[PDB]
Amino acid sequence: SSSTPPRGVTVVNNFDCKRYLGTWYEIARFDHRAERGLEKVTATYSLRDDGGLNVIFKGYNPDRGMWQQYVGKAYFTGAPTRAALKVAFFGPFYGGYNVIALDREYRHALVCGPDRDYLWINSRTPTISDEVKQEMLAVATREGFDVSKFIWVQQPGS
């Protein structure tokens, strides 16, 4: 089931959706065809009339010589105080989106998909401290993700 969280993963359960809105830089990702080779990736989150979120993915594609966007819609699968969502880019075809770690300042987030082949480190800044990087890798490995799969995404100052 590609719209539920991975078995045996803790999801953030005191989620304040309003503080999560705005722009997040992608620090690291497990690669798949949608993202592979994209640089300087951000995700931008905004509230919709219908209680879902707009998710605008932006990345630089060196082979095409262009910036490209993916326009999606995210909805909470349960209460909006549990950071368990599902995202679609076309039609009723959803993937799981789960915030599994978040600092009290809503400045750094570990986000996974519906299984352990999907994981992202995200930051309000394009670079993170070695201390924040270490905590992210510790949380991910404790939840059973193979962090050797990370691609460290090209960002200004990386």
Numbering used by the authors: 20 to 177
Study authors write:
Later, proteins capable of binding and increasing the fluorescent signals of fluorogenic molecules became commonly referred to as fluorogen activating proteins (FAPs). In silico shortlisting with the further screening of the lipocalin Blc mutants launched DiBs FAPs tags family binding green and red BODIPY dyes. To test this hypothesis, we used Rosetta for computational ligand docking followed by protein binding pocket redesign to further improve the previously described FAP DiB1 that is capable of binding to a BODIPY-like dye M739. The designed protein, DiB-RM, shows higher brightness, localization precision, and apparent photostability in protein-PAINT super-resolution imaging compared to its parental variant DiB1.
The resulting protein, designated DiB-RM, performs better than its parental variant both in vitro (except for the dissociation constant) and as a tag for protein-PAINT with higher brightness, localization precision, and apparent photostability. We speculate that the observed decrease in affinity to the ligand is caused by introducing two aromatic amino acids in the protein’s binding pocket (76F and 89Y). While the presence of these amino acids is most likely responsible for the observed increased brightness of the DiB-RM:M739 complex compared to the parental DiB1:M739 through the better protein:ligand interface packing, in the absence of the ligand these bulky amino acids might partially hinder the entrance of the ligand in the binding pocket. Crystallization analysis of DiB-RM in the apo form in different conditions further confirmed the already known high flexibility of the E/F lipocalin loop that was not properly addressed during our computational redesign. (C) The side and the top views on the overlay of the DiB1 complex (shown in yellow) with the DiB-RM apo structure (shown in light gray). Interestingly, in both cases, the 50 top-scored structures contained a mixture of different ligand positions one of which was matching the chromophore position in DiB1 while the other was very close to our original docked pose. This can also explain the larger apparent dissociation constant of this new complex. Rigidifying of this loop through shortening or designed interactions can provide better stabilization of the ligand in the binding pocket.
